[PDB]
Amino acid sequence: NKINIGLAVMKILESWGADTIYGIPSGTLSSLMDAMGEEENNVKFLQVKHEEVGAMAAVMQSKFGGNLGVTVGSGGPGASHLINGLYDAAMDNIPVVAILGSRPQRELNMDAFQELNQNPMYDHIAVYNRRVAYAEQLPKLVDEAARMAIAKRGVAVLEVPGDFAKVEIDNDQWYSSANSLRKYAPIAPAAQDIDAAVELLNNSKRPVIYAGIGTMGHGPAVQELARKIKAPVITTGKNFETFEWDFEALTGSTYRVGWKPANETILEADTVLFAGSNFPFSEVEGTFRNVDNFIQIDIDPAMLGKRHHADVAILGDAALAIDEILNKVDAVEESAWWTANLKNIANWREYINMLETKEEGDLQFYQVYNAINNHADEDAIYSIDVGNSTQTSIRHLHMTPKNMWRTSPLFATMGIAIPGGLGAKNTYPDRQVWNIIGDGAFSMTYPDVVTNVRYNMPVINVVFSNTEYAFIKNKYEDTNKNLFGVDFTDVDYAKIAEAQGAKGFTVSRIEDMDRVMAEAVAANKAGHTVVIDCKITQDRPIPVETLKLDSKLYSEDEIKAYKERYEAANLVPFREYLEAEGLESKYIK
Amino acid sequence: NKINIGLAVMKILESWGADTIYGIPSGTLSSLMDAMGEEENNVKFLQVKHEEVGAMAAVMQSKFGGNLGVTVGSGGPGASHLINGLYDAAMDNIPVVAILGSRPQRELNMDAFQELNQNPMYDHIAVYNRRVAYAEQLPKLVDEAARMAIAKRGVAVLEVPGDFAKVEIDNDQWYSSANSLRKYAPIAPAAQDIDAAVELLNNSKRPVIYAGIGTMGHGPAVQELARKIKAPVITTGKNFETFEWDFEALTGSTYRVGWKPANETILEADTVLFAGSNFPFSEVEGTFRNVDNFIQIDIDPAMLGKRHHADVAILGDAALAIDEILNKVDAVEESAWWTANLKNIANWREYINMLETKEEGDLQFYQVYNAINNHADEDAIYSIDVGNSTQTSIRHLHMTPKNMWRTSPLFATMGIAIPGGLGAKNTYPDRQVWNIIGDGAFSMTYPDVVTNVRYNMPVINVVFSNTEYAFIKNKYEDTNKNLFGVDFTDVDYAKIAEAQGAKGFTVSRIEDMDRVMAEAVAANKAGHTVVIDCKITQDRPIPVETLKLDSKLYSEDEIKAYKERYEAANLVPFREYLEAEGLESKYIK
Amino acid sequence: NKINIGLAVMKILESWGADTIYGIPSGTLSSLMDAMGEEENNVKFLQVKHEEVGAMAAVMQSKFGGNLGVTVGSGGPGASHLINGLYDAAMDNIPVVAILGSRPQRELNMDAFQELNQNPMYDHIAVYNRRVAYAEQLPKLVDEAARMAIAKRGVAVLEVPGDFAKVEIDNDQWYSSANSLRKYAPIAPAAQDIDAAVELLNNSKRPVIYAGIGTMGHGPAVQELARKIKAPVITTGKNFETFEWDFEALTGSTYRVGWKPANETILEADTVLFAGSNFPFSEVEGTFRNVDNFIQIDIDPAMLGKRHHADVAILGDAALAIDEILNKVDAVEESAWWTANLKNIANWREYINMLETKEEGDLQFYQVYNAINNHADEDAIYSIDVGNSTQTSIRHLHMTPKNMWRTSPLFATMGIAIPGGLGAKNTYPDRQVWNIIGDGAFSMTYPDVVTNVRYNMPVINVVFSNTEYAFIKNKYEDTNKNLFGVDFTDVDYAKIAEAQGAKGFTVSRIEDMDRVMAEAVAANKAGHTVVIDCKITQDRPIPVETLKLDSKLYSEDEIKAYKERYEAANLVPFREYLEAEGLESKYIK
Ligand SMILES: Cc1cc2nc3c(=O)[nH]c(=O)nc-3n(C[C@H](O)[C@H](O)[C@H](O)COP(=O)(O)OP(=O)(O)OC[C@H]3O[C@@H](n4cnc5c(N)ncnc54)[C@H](O)[C@@H]3O)c2cc1C
Ligand SMILES: Cc1cc2nc3c(=O)[nH]c(=O)nc-3n(C[C@H](O)[C@H](O)[C@H](O)COP(=O)(O)OP(=O)(O)OC[C@H]3O[C@@H](n4cnc5c(N)ncnc54)[C@H](O)[C@@H]3O)c2cc1C
Ligand SMILES: Cc1cc2nc3c(=O)[nH]c(=O)nc-3n(C[C@H](O)[C@H](O)[C@H](O)COP(=O)(O)OP(=O)(O)OC[C@H]3O[C@@H](n4cnc5c(N)ncnc54)[C@H](O)[C@@H]3O)c2cc1C
Ligand SMILES: CC(=O)c1sc(CCOP(=O)(O)OP(=O)(O)O)c(C)[n+]1Cc1cnc(C)nc1N
Ligand SMILES: CC(=O)c1sc(CCOP(=O)(O)OP(=O)(O)O)c(C)[n+]1Cc1cnc(C)nc1N
Ligand SMILES: CC(=O)c1sc(CCOP(=O)(O)OP(=O)(O)O)c(C)[n+]1Cc1cnc(C)nc1N
Ligand SMILES: [Mg+2]
Ligand SMILES: [Mg+2]
Ligand SMILES: [Mg+2]
């Protein structure tokens, strides 16, 4: 007639679909874990080597479309180790339950061993943050923690004295509210707002669609609208998978982790259809400084008019809004604007393709991605870390909506890749998973490669060894009138992988890349976790946030040096393509 | 006539003796670092692979008697990575300056990239926590940060917008208050309080001295007092180096990370001289439940009467107090109490020595320490990690005041060892440094082994590979009516070390341990960082917090099993030694 | 071509409808206020005597259906004084912008006069909490503060260095996003969920509708449903105005601030239609312990299944849900259940009416309310303070949807009444406003009576002088086996009102109450603020949370004493009415 509180907690977690708990065992968590596996319960424990990797995996699990993740941290140091993963979830508004273990109740406030008040730890970023006051309410609080993490789209934190889960209660003294879980269906936009948008788009001479992840699942519709009104497409760094990598009108993304086309288009555009985005560089980089009209679509009222004055605001689902717009807007037969953009994009793709298809020489980022493109499954999942890998992956990977690409986009914590792969593979065990990592970030997390090995969750780690914290050093050449402290010694990551039970590869030449990738993938299909140590050059990826190509903006000397350093001799400034179509730059005089 | 704000900051840090900054480069920290090395400034940057290791090294640097440490974390993820190191410093009351990099001022509050309010992050544990409001006051705030960290004995945190250090100011618009640094000299205790202590000690039939780190530097005096009044000595887990490892009257420490003698003595004692300690298990483990009188010595008023009712309270330096007491107290010629304790200690040392000196078989903790004892320098420094290593090191290392032993004693974060070695070697470059680590903790920090290699700071890493998070699993056998999730796969750490430019060794047999240690030390003296992968058994160290040896407390079956499992056939319960001297247990009936 | 930042802020506030700022002038707020009134701006300043009254008025302004309120607090003490008002808004989820003045930027971090970090002050309860980093972004942050307070339904806090508002900017460097303000229209519920509800209601033998403020604006529909299926109605303490005070099937509210009928009905009910409520006593008072089925309607997913296991969960507007249910459910011709409830309600109304209509004697709460009922406008607004006034007002006021009743229901801060009247009168200048206050709460706020006088915002303060903190003392008789410290001396509040420029009245006899109220109202219509000092008895209002009337639950002695003390000789326990209709209590045996 009674049940162990720990088993009740597992039953509740199971009811909310939270069937995986990431973490490291602890005395302050013994009771909870001791209950795992009872009465046919299916909540599994995935042991990591560093609690931050567990927290990040639990979060990335949801990012990749998986179930609500749960992460545990032992009282004190275990709990504090969850921070980078929780801050990432908070900034990305991703649901995740964090359980902080604690000393038994009798020890609280006694200044005992590893005994402290952990309530302040995550109060600032959490949507729910409580210290269980007595054993009997633990089930209710775990249930609410799940409900709140999901409803508030954020981090739900519970501090749990270690002695509570051992307590027993009547089976009728607990319940799950998972059965009452309800979510709102996509909301249609106000016709009045769609019409105002249509009018502006019809009258615009240089329209451009800036699509954020709010357009996820509606890329075809966005591409259709783009072609109907001849409006080029700009995407955000988080939304590339939404488009066919080779879409004729895709200009890429603006600023640093972007493409040349996008950065030029935005400064020449008249009307922007800001769809489902909260682009953070908007104000500080003056992204929309030359735009005449601004139309925004978003399901969140707090975002309407946030990044720029909105001439038209549309509250509602991006899909529905795009569909309504597509159907009501006037078709455009030809546009000098569209034609110039297509050619500018084509020019950029020539540049990118020639870099990717070199046949011999010292290995660069480009050829590694080329190889990934020639060997990856069409529905491959990419877990991207922070640094040059982010910048290059969205330029050189050839994705489509069949893929998934995720990173730590806003908080931007390094080391998100390996955890990303764990959450992905846990969700899709038969799906090919890639972790694209810089050596600096890999260095903050490679001990967890063994986790994939131990749990038979085969992933392919691609490590870019340039022996520098490049993303910073590269920028140091600009912002810094010096440099200093951005390089380190190279280590044999392939050998480290072997020591961990993984399969390691080392490659440093372009002419060996295709074979190495072939062998790495074959190994992954043999059930092995792989680490490809790519010893690349220190060539800095082309900095499209500072395009030194237009002779009316930079000196010939500057242009020559820029072309030379970035192998961009054939890149043509957008103004040339505009003028060829009889148009004039609206800001370059 | 002007100076770069960044150079001013370095000059101020240099004036406070803070000549080393630990961290990882960042765009949000570029300005500050760019200034390092100018105008003959000698503030060096030590690059780590994970910011938590940098934060911990900066803290351990002071713990080991070094200069004020400085740690940097890039805005957001870099800063949050400092947490485990800062919480350790906070709980241990260790001075440390933490600089959090941040987006440029113009980006603050704009919800820009990696832009957030970091003030809440460490407000709870810091003694100083401010966000620089404008460039010109950065020097003043760094100066105050140093002054406050030192005066308040804690964490001083500054959030610094990345664009401030580039600003220039008049040389007369900044100054360091380091020249005004003043500290109080040891304060003599009130004679009235010393006399009350003396009277109690003179009249006590079973005195015992419980010495905490407040007695650091006065071990000889404590040993002299112990012999004068025939009072055995109990130490805290943090204070072993204060005594000669083989002192005839040293009973060790109480509770889990302790010895058998100490745990028995405390339950049989009448009067306790609690000198310079804030022992955290006092109340929750009922350490002093059978004590009749309690005398406390401490320089901190907040501690007087905290762990137990104090019959006599002495405010002042432990050295001075011990000296005053020693001189005024009556000499004791013989004591049945003393005699029984000495024999109980001798019995324990027989047990410990026989474990350490085995000649053949599967390697255990014991023989690794035996080897360390036979090959280490007499002034060696030991950086101890958290787990079975802590428990075993204080039982098997043969230290004296010439040594230094430090860990993460209260917050108890794993992974403190490697950082400890960095701070130690940075402070004493020609001194032998040992990092004693469990494989679980090593797994949270081994990527930083390369840091010692890269910076030519040779250390000896001793890794205990039992393929479990033993300290927890061991206790799981008691507290848990099950277990689960406490084991992992073994990895070749020696091979990982080689891949990092370090020298690796692997040992699994007792008969090879002496030679392996010899070769490891010789390598360390050759300037190499070493990793000794000790493949040990899963034998649980004897649990002295639950001594099942007295037939009046446990069944014969229990005693037999306990002796069998812990190879303690020859250990004799303290009550036998007491009775042999004509005394009776005061609680065992 | 340029504009003062302060004027820009006022223009933005005006665009969001925030035309009133409550507070007290300050050096740290001088710049902002100095700009009020410029270029035809219409943002007015309402000066209070205590900043907490200003914060509460700004909040109550929205509670009463007014515009977004703004409250200001001078750096340090002025800002901290806002706390009770902000916590009330936070717990009630009411939008409000709070501006904290601060020392000029140059003084920040200098430990200057009244200079401190106010970011921690309200971080825990705010939905937006930032310190303006530079003058130029102040406009953008005020605009976002308004947008966020509204979108997040909570407290938006901005700390503003006093020197920023003086700075000038280009008119094109600021904009308001108020034009993009959009809100979701009522969402229809899932038909599947409505049908499950209907089925349960059709099959229920004892249905009951528990309506919270989510049903606001749909009382007629709720009353119609109640009559159609013969389900009595229970309301929450915040939702009385939604029903006609004399609705035949209104049982009142459960627990302490409730009626006898409601408290009995809930323990005898089978199926509950929990509509638009988040009743806080649910679990701790076991409100639904005897209920068989539970159906919940709410627009917030986080609330579904929170207060009790939900057999049916309906996500969507309460109006739409009630309408769908009303139309699909089966009509019920007669019900023994309904009949018994109506008679129990009628019995309660006989009791209440006889108390209210006494003709002579010492004045009690009852006759004051009787008088208010006979003289108040039909659309009067009632601002209720915390204490016996809350308990009694919902029992003795005769409200309808034409009225508005508001208090501090969850955080429950005393002193909310006067601020409530200010916000109400500011919103509806020609509407009759009543402040019902206990003397204890009046004592925390009467200096602000002058505010109504000074700003010609005539209100009627009704003060219940029982010279005790009754709501507590009353309960002290139960929970406390003593009492102590709950009484104080009586003061002449009428005389205090006169000293403040208000009109004071004093009444202590039932036979004078009608005339006094008549004269008080006539004075209010003469444009004067009135204070009616009601010297009442210390008679404790009947405690319906402990009904000692059923002989099968209490001894005859207890019942006699209960009837005697609360003049309830004629109250009949519900079980009698149930049995008379051939039904049996489901829990009283
Ligand atoms: C090292 C690094 C460098 C980077 N560099 C760049 C860079 O140069 N350029 C760049 O663009 N990014 C860059 N990023 C990523 C960048 O920081 C942002 O995270 C990203 O651009 C935000 O993209 P977003 O607008 O698509 O989505 P979010 O910021 O997640 O916003 C999505 C919006 O969509 C709305 N929404 C959600 N669902 C719907 C729906 N159904 N209908 C309508 N609206 C909906 C939401 O309410 C929200 O407002 C970088 C990241 C890293 C780690
Ligand atoms: C995994 C793990 C297990 C552990 N297990 C144990 C265990 O079983 N048993 C155990 O004992 N410890 C154990 N520890 C260590 C333990 O948690 C405490 O940190 C330690 O015992 C505190 O020792 P202390 O009293 O010497 O010093 P502190 O707690 O640092 O207190 C020192 C006191 O000395 C005072 N003081 C300082 N200078 C002076 C002066 N000049 N004169 C006078 N007073 C002065 C201070 O004000 C303070 O009150 C463990 C640690 C870990 C990480
Ligand atoms: C001294 C004091 C004593 C008190 N004593 C009592 C007492 O004895 N009994 C009592 O009942 N109260 C009492 N109260 C008030 C009590 O504390 C609660 O604040 C009140 O009962 C909450 O009422 P509620 O459920 O209507 O609304 P709320 O708690 O405000 O919850 C309203 C719910 O409606 C939902 N909602 C909003 N709009 C819609 C919509 N359009 N459609 C559907 N759902 C919607 C919301 O999401 C929310 O879940 C007392 C207050 C004080 C100050
Ligand atoms: C964006 C940001 O803040 C970056 S990008 C970057 C370079 C990463 O180097 P890696 O070697 O992994 O990759 P590479 O650029 O390909 O060489 C650093 C150090 N940072 C700062 C930083 C520091 N520390 C942490 C934990 N997270 C971040 N994001
Ligand atoms: C004390 C405490 O909280 C311990 S002791 C311990 C076992 C350490 O295992 P390791 O393999 O390093 O050593 P071993 O015991 O010799 O096998 C754990 C997991 N914990 C919990 C824990 C978790 N995570 C972190 C960051 N710090 C701590 N202290
Ligand atoms: C509910 C709650 O917490 C109450 S009800 C109550 C009695 C109020 O006395 P008053 O004289 O105003 O009214 P009366 O009951 O009619 O005599 C007190 C002191 N409290 C505690 C309390 C204390 N202080 C403040 C600021 N707010 C509250 N709510
Ligand atoms: Mg790199
Ligand atoms: Mg281990
Ligand atoms: Mg009163």
mmCIF file of C-alpha atoms and ligand atoms in Angstrom, chain C residues 52 84 256 365 385-392 408 411-415 437-444 464-474 486 488 536, ligand 6:
data_model
loop_
_atom_site.group_PDB
_atom_site.id
_atom_site.type_symbol
_atom_site.label_atom_id
_atom_site.label_comp_id
_atom_site.label_asym_id
_atom_site.label_seq_id
_atom_site.Cartn_x
_atom_site.Cartn_y
_atom_site.Cartn_z
ATOM 1 C CA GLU C 52 5.569 52.224 -0.803
ATOM 2 C CA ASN C 84 5.886 45.782 -0.665
ATOM 3 C CA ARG C 256 -11.365 31.560 6.341
ATOM 4 C CA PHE C 365 -18.594 45.346 11.215
ATOM 5 C CA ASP C 385 -7.078 46.133 2.915
ATOM 6 C CA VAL C 386 -5.733 43.022 4.675
ATOM 7 C CA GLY C 387 -7.291 41.545 7.800
ATOM 8 C CA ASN C 388 -10.807 41.181 9.170
ATOM 9 C CA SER C 389 -11.863 43.697 6.497
ATOM 10 C CA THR C 390 -11.112 41.110 3.801
ATOM 11 C CA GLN C 391 -13.010 38.351 5.601
ATOM 12 C CA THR C 392 -16.057 40.508 6.317
ATOM 13 C CA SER C 408 -3.414 42.302 -1.910
ATOM 14 C CA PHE C 411 1.401 38.502 -0.877
ATOM 15 C CA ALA C 412 -1.255 40.071 1.349
ATOM 16 C CA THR C 413 0.525 43.250 2.396
ATOM 17 C CA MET C 414 -1.370 45.524 4.768
ATOM 18 C CA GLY C 415 -1.748 49.127 3.622
ATOM 19 C CA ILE C 437 -9.388 49.458 6.157
ATOM 20 C CA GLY C 438 -8.547 47.928 9.525
ATOM 21 C CA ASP C 439 -6.971 50.320 12.041
ATOM 22 C CA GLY C 440 -3.685 48.401 12.001
ATOM 23 C CA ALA C 441 -3.277 48.807 8.232
ATOM 24 C CA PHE C 442 -4.600 52.359 8.329
ATOM 25 C CA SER C 443 -1.806 53.050 10.825
ATOM 26 C CA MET C 444 0.763 51.963 8.237
ATOM 27 C CA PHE C 464 -12.586 49.650 11.480
ATOM 28 C CA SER C 465 -11.191 50.561 14.890
ATOM 29 C CA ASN C 466 -11.181 47.478 17.111
ATOM 30 C CA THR C 467 -7.826 48.463 18.675
ATOM 31 C CA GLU C 468 -6.274 45.088 17.793
ATOM 32 C CA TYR C 469 -4.589 43.295 14.906
ATOM 33 C CA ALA C 470 -7.743 41.166 15.009
ATOM 34 C CA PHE C 471 -7.180 38.817 12.066
ATOM 35 C CA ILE C 472 -4.196 37.489 14.046
ATOM 36 C CA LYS C 473 -5.485 37.751 17.619
ATOM 37 C CA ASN C 474 -8.719 36.018 16.565
ATOM 38 C CA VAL C 486 -1.921 42.129 19.531
ATOM 39 C CA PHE C 488 -2.908 48.906 20.952
ATOM 40 C CA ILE C 536 -16.526 48.742 16.573
HETATM 41 C C1 LIG D 6 -3.046 38.292 6.680
HETATM 42 C C2 LIG D 6 -1.816 38.825 7.400
HETATM 43 O O1 LIG D 6 -0.703 38.422 7.120
HETATM 44 C C3 LIG D 6 -2.041 39.852 8.485
HETATM 45 S S1 LIG D 6 -3.604 40.259 8.926
HETATM 46 C C4 LIG D 6 -3.065 41.262 10.203
HETATM 47 C C5 LIG D 6 -4.046 41.994 11.058
HETATM 48 C C6 LIG D 6 -4.361 43.335 10.436
HETATM 49 O O2 LIG D 6 -4.879 44.188 11.475
HETATM 50 P P1 LIG D 6 -5.852 45.399 11.139
HETATM 51 O O3 LIG D 6 -5.971 46.121 12.411
HETATM 52 O O4 LIG D 6 -5.466 46.135 9.909
HETATM 53 O O5 LIG D 6 -7.236 44.650 10.748
HETATM 54 P P2 LIG D 6 -8.342 43.793 11.531
HETATM 55 O O6 LIG D 6 -7.958 42.345 11.386
HETATM 56 O O7 LIG D 6 -9.678 44.212 11.009
HETATM 57 O O8 LIG D 6 -8.237 44.217 13.013
HETATM 58 C C7 LIG D 6 -1.706 41.269 10.284
HETATM 59 C C8 LIG D 6 -0.860 42.023 11.268
HETATM 60 N N1 LIG D 6 -1.130 40.457 9.279
HETATM 61 C C9 LIG D 6 0.362 40.317 9.146
HETATM 62 C C10 LIG D 6 0.973 41.415 8.305
HETATM 63 C C11 LIG D 6 1.912 42.186 8.903
HETATM 64 N N2 LIG D 6 2.521 43.216 8.255
HETATM 65 C C12 LIG D 6 2.191 43.497 6.968
HETATM 66 C C13 LIG D 6 2.894 44.638 6.335
HETATM 67 N N3 LIG D 6 1.293 42.805 6.297
HETATM 68 C C14 LIG D 6 0.654 41.750 6.916
HETATM 69 N N4 LIG D 6 -0.234 41.114 6.189
#
